[PDB]
Paper text:
Oligopeptidases B (OpBs, EC 3.4.21.83) are trypsin-like serine peptidases that belong to the prolyl oligopeptidase (POP) family (S9 family) of clan SC. Endopeptidases from the S9A subfamily cleave peptide bonds on the carbonyl side of either proline (POPs) or basic amino acid residues (OpBs). The catalytic domain includes the α/β-hydrolase fold, which is canonical for serine proteases and is located at the C-terminal part of the molecule, and the N-terminal loop, which is divided from the α/β hydrolase fold by the regulatory β-propeller domain. The β-propeller domain consists of seven blade-shaped beta sheets arranged around the central axis according to the open Velcro topology (no connection between first and last blades) and restricts access of substrates larger than 3 kDa to the catalytic triad located in the interdomain cavity.
The structure of wild type SpOpB bound to tosyl-L-lysine chloromethyl ketone (TCK) was determined at 2.2 Å resolution. The unit cell dimensions of the SpOpB-TCK crystal were 75.529 Å × 89.660 Å × 108.650 Å, a crystallographic space group was P2(1)2(1)2(1), an asymmetric unit contained a monomer in a crystal lattice. A clear electron density for one molecule of covalently bound TCK, which is a modified lysine residue tosylated at the N-terminus and chloromethylated at the C-terminus, was observed from the 2mFo-DFc difference map in the active site. The closed state of SpOpB was associated with covalent binding of a single TCK molecule to the catalytic S532 and H652 residues. The binding to the OG atom of S532 occurs through the hemiacetal carbon atom of TCK, and to the NE2 atom of H652, it occurs through the methylene group of TCK. Despite the presence of spermine in the crystallization mixture, no spermine molecules were found in the crystal structure. According to these criteria, the newly obtained structure of SpOpB-TCK indeed represents the closed state of the enzyme. The SpOpB-TCK complex can be considered as an analogue of the transition state in the proteolytic reaction catalyzed by S532. The position of the lysine side chain of TCK coincides with the position of the P1 arginyl of AIP and the position of the tosyl ring coincides with that of the P2 valine of AIP. Both the lysine amino group of TCK and the arginyl guanidino group of AIP interact with E576 and E607 carboxyl groups of SpOpB and TbOpB, respectively. The carbonyl group of P2 valine of AIP is H-bound to the R650-NH1 atom of TbOpB, while the similarly located O1S atom of TCK is H-bound to the Q619-NE2 of SpOpB.
Residue numbers in the entry: 2 to 677
The structure:
């Protein structure tokens, strides 16, 4: 009964002589210090509560259904690192993992490093960003988010007696490494207002952080500061990264007074990363090709890099792991992840087959290089997430664990890789899955999912929650659209900057091909995207509103032009080589044509559920809030338009193994009611 009507306070923004009027600009508050804002967000939540009350039963049915799939007890396969065996445990009803370990010689008794349920201690949000035991096995460092804004606290535990030290490192990125003395930690501090990771500090454990020494400050705010430690343990790396360009600095992990030593000075459009092992640096670099190569060197000097793997236009080299006798690399070709092993001596090459049309494989955690046992991951649209161990020499493979899914028989579902020819003749890969026994050409609701930014890939993986749609006749689709990484670096570059419109075109083209070929019911087409996938949702409903019956747009990036004009707002300065720099006229004009907030107009929009989190640090809460306000004022349809603001979460929604399914049940009930 009557949606809330945002206050209008005309706010002009002038760039290149173009004045845009933002009536809803006031919805932005930089602390949360304006009662007017909360009142709007609270009123939208009350309208959403009232409007979705009918589905109360169906939500609790789906919640209960999704929870019923999950083993209540869930134990990881143990591993051994520096004389200790480690395991991660959920016990019945637990929202968060318990991390335990024991001496390698021991079997009966395990010690608790940390209990997430104890640490979460009543709070609506908790994330362990990282935990790591000192090289001397005496101390534990943990990075925890208590709020959901990804401002990680770092704290330290004495493992001998399970006491905590007095100090906390605040507003960190959660990225840290131990010096080899186990007394010092290096860690990354975030800018107080932009939240950009920009400073490395040295901290002596057990001391006041006011005494922490600044080691490196990144002067160019288009870059991110991270920390890594090499396989050799000789170096802690300052990894400075941006869209286009890398630089690594070495810190001697064996010394207390290390200062950053330059590896290779930054060069525009040269991305590199390194490890150190067997006395050599191993470099993944795009110096000679966009799809990257792998290089070995005794020295930093780029002229000395020996080619191990030459860049191939057909193969994206993505990642690598170093063993005693084998190099193992993660590669992508024909839209599919593979792993390849190369013997350092014989140069013999072996590849890991998978015949599934619709899977992902990856290097899992391998704590020790001195072994012939590779642990690697596998998941598909039809096979739950699996941990394999491969003997690299004998080829024998053992399945260590497959995720148990209750109330599920894989033989009931089938998946396909389909190729869709886009409006410009370019072939776009699609992964889809459905329940065979309920499938009939032309009759099944479609759920089409896209992201398509940053060269991130929507790799086909198993979802247990997704069975709630598959078991009600849905065909679930991953559209591997340009801007994503699915076909290598050129696929990414062909969907950003002056090519970003290809992301949106590709998603429409895939959706129309699928309806034309009878995979979906033309009246029951749903789409979902989050964050950069929310940009996708926003652009496609402006451009092709009548295509979709209903839309879920999570933490959506929609105020593109205003956001990219403002260096004060988190992530802006790091994304000029993604969308463009709208201080430049060409970029301003190109981006304005798709910026969803700016292109809302008087037309019929599909049914829409917009979700955000008040603390969201990547897409600030006001973008979706403004976008809903402006949609409510101008839309000509009277279809559902709901805003759900979670007051106690951020970019990744509700924390907790079971709690997360509250958001998915709400989303899926909204879609299922429209598919009745
Ligand atoms: C969650 C998401 O897609 C957001 C959108 C942020 C838009 C900022 N104006 N991106 S992110 O911050 O999570 C992010 C994810 C991957 C990469 C490579 C960069 C940023």
């Amino acid at each position: 009964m009557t949606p809330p009507k945002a206050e209008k306070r005309p706010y002009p923004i002038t760039t290149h002589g173009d004045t845009r009027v933002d009536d809803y600009y006031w919805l932005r508050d930089d602390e949360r210090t304006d009662p007017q804002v909360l009142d709007y967000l609270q009123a939208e939540n009350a309208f959403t509560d009232a409007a979705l009350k009918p589905q109360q039963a169906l939500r609790e049915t789906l919640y209960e259904e999704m929870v019923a799939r999950i083993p209540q007890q869930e134990h990881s396969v143990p591993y051994v690192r520096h004389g200790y065996r480690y395991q991660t445990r959920f016990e019945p009803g637990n929202e968060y993992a318990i991390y335990v370990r024991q001496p390698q010689a021991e079997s009966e008794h395990w010690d608790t490093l940390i209990d997430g349920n104890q640490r979460a201690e009543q709070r609506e949000f908790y994330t362990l960003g990282g935990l790591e035991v000192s090289p001397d096995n005496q101390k534990l460092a943990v990075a925890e988010d208590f709020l959901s804004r990804r401002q990680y606290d770092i704290r330290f535990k004495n493992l001998s007696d399970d006491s905590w030290t007095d100090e906390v490192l605040e507003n960190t990125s959660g990225s840290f490494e131990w010096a080899n003395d186990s007394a010092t930690v290096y860690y990354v501090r975030k800018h107080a207002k932009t939240l950009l990771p920009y400073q490395v500090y040295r901290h002596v454990v057990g001391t006041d952080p006011q005494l922490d020494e600044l080691i490196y400050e990144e002067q160019d705010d288009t870059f991110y500061v991270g920390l890594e430690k090499t396989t050799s343990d000789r170096f802690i790396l300052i990894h400075l990264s941006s869209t286009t360009t890398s630089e690594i600095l070495l810190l001697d992990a064996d010394r207390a007074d290390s200062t950053p030593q330059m590896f290779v000075p930054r060069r525009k459009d040269h991305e590199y990363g390194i490890d150190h092992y067997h006395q050599h640096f191993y470099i993944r670099s795009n110096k000679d090709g966009k799809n990257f190569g792998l290089y070995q060197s005794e020295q930093a000097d780029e002229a000395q890099w020996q080619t191990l793997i030459a860049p191939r236009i057909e193969v994206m080299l993505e990642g690598f792991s170093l063993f005693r006798d084998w190099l193992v690399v993660e590669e992508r070709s024909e839209g599919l992840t593979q792993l390849r092993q190369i013997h350092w001596q014989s140069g013999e090459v072996k590849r890991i087959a998978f015949d599934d049309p619709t899977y992902t494989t990856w290097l899992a955690y391998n704590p020790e290089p001195e072994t012939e046992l590779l642990r690697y991951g596998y998941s598909s649209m039809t096979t739950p997430t699996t941990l394999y161990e491969l003997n690299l020499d004998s080829d024998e493979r053992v399945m260590l664990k497959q995720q148990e899914v209750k109330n599920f028989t894989p033989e009931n579902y089938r998946s396909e890789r389909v190729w869709v020819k886009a409006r410009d003749g370019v072939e776009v890969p699609v992964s889809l899955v459905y329940r065979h026994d309920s499938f009939a050409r032309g009759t099944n609701p479609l759920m089409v999912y896209g992201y398509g930014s940053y060269g991130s890939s929507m790799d086909p993986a198993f979802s247990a929650s997704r069975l709630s749609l598959l078991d009600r006749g849905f065909v679930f689709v991953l559209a591997h659209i340009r801007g994503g990484g699915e076909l290598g670096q050129l696929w990414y570059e062909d969907g950003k900057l002056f090519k970003k419109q290809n992301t949106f075109n590709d998603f429409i083209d895939v959706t129309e091909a699928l309806i034309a070929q009878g995979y979906g019911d033309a009246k029951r087409v749903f789409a979902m995207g989050g964050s950069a996938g929310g940009l996708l949702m926003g652009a496609v409903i402006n451009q092709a509103p009548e295509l979709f019956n209903g839309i879920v747009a999570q933490v959506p990036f929609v105020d593109v032009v205003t956001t990219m004009l403002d260096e004060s707002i988190p992530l802006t300065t790091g994304e000029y080589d993604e969308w463009g720099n709208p201080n430049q006229q060409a970029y301003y004009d190109y981006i304005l044509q798709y910026s969803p907030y700016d292109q809302v107009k008087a037309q019929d929009y599909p049914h829409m559920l917009v979700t955000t989190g008040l603390h969201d640090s990547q897409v600030q809460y006001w973008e979706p809030a403004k976008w809903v306000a402006k949609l409510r004022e101008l839309k000509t349809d009277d279809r559902q338009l709901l805003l759900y603001t979670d007051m106690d979460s951020g970019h990744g929604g509700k924390s907790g193994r079971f709690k997360a399914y509250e958001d998915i049940a709400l989303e899926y009930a909204f879609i299922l009611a429209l598919a009745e």
